[PDB]
């Protein structure tokens, strides 16, 4: 297996919401044509590979992860030949496309849950996880374990007809499959993966990749949140006794016979479990993204929020940037996504204009500096902030956010101070401050749309949006198509490179290192912090030279960091 890597592991990843980038037809609702119409945008950015969301048949309980058809387009995005022209679209402008790849569950609505829930005599009853129900002490009917869905609620939905629970880890309207069963394997690689890569695409990300598989014995979950009747199971789900079996089943009927890339989301907490996913000579997937830098602001399971610890972000970010280079693995890095709040809000400033366009480049500076691949987010680029605290919890449209909110509701009797810190705790972290359209321009709603969008546009778009800042020389736009630059030009170091931690014990400015083969080292500072601080890089280096800094070079002052100036020289 001699394969074309080259162009995944320095390629920079621009993933696609469709639902939320361009209305082409003024229904509210982002499309296909839309996104074709916008190519040339995303090519202007830097991107060599579009990450499309998913956009297939659904009915959209969580926004195209419930699919009901593997071979359909979900109607609003447009028609099936849409779909085959947006390929042909990508690759006229030298774009590669991958796709999403969400086979642990089916929506509720797939054909093939509607045959398997019909009977418990039916062919495919055994395609999804049928249990039989539990009785407690008093003889009331309990589900067979102590399992949470991720989306809130027991994982477990009792279906009145065939007197049987079947499970789900995300919503009830997403069933999860039954991976023994092989016969369910062969359709889910059928309909799911070669259909897709016999029309053509660049490969996959692929949705949960770590919980497919699992424990034959469904045990009951530890107490992970002290006192709580249900634990979320995703620490006993993850790497199954079937996982890597099924990874390596699916390299070997569909990833090795075309030329693709594949990124699975998250990742064992181990180098070692890693690798089992990512080591070239496993012959699995390509990369991971890992939760644990996205985790270092709040712990979802107890729904808080928390301080950023400075050595714990410095600990997590060497975890998984060690693989490039002492492995044959890789890792990706990336600061957004569809399921996070935006960057410059988590883990910079959005207080004021000059603080927006400030943060924009400073986290550009973090993440063109990491390596592996690369993956930004749409609006990342201009710098979209969370949706601020005047925007009411009926805009925050997303089930998670939805069913959070409603479950404090439910369980304080209304208890507005419950309420409050709930509505502050998504106000930072809801999956809705990436959902919230594209912002284009500054006509009605950001230019998205000529009708009314389905989520209600970012107020501060008529600041932040793609034309203020295409001809400014100095926009965050502007910042990230140089900082691209300067990374592809400089890949042995900033692509390829190996990270080492200096100044570990530092709580303000964290340092590290980016070194090539041939000797080639950069040092990088970035300073976090609301205020300047000393800084001396002669104690970290015995000769630097400044290649660029955040706030502009002539504005660099020598023994000192400014707030959030993130610097790049090269050293040695
Ligand atoms: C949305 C996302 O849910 C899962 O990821 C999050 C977990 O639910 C959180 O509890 C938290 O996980 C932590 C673990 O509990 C902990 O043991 C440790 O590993 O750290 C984790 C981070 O603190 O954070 C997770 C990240 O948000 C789930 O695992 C993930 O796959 C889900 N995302 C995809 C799944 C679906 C289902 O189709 C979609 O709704 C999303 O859009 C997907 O992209
Ligand atoms: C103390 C803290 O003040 C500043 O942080 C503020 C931000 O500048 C504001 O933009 C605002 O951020 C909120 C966003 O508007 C909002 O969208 C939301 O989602 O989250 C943000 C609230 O967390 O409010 C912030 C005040 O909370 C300042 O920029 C920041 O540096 C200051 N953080 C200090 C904390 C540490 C300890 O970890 C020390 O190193 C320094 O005192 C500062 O770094
Ligand atoms: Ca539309």
Redesign the pocket.
Known sequence: QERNTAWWREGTVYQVYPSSFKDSNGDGIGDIPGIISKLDYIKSVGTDIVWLSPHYKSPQV?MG?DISDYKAIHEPYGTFDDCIKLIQECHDRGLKIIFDL?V??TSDQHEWFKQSRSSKSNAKRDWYIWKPAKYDEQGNRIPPNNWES?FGGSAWEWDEETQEYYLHL?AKE?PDINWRNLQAREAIYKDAILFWLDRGIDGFRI??VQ?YSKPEDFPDAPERVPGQKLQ?P??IVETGPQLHEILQEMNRKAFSKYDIMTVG??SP?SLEKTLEYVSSSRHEIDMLFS??F??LDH???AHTLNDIDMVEMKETVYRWQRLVGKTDGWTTFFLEN??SGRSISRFASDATPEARNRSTKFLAVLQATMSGTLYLYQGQEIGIPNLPDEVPIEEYKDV?SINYYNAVKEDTKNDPDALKKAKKYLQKVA?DHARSPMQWDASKHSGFTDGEPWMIVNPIYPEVNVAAQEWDADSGLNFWRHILKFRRQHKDVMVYGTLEVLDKENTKVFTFTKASESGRTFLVALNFTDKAVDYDVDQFASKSTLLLSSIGNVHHKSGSLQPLEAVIFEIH
Do not use: K, L, M
């Open positions: 969580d992860y969400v642990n569950h991720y995300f997403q949705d949960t919980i979320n995703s620490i989301e998250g907490p939760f644990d996205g985790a712990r979802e399971i569809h399921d998670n999956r």
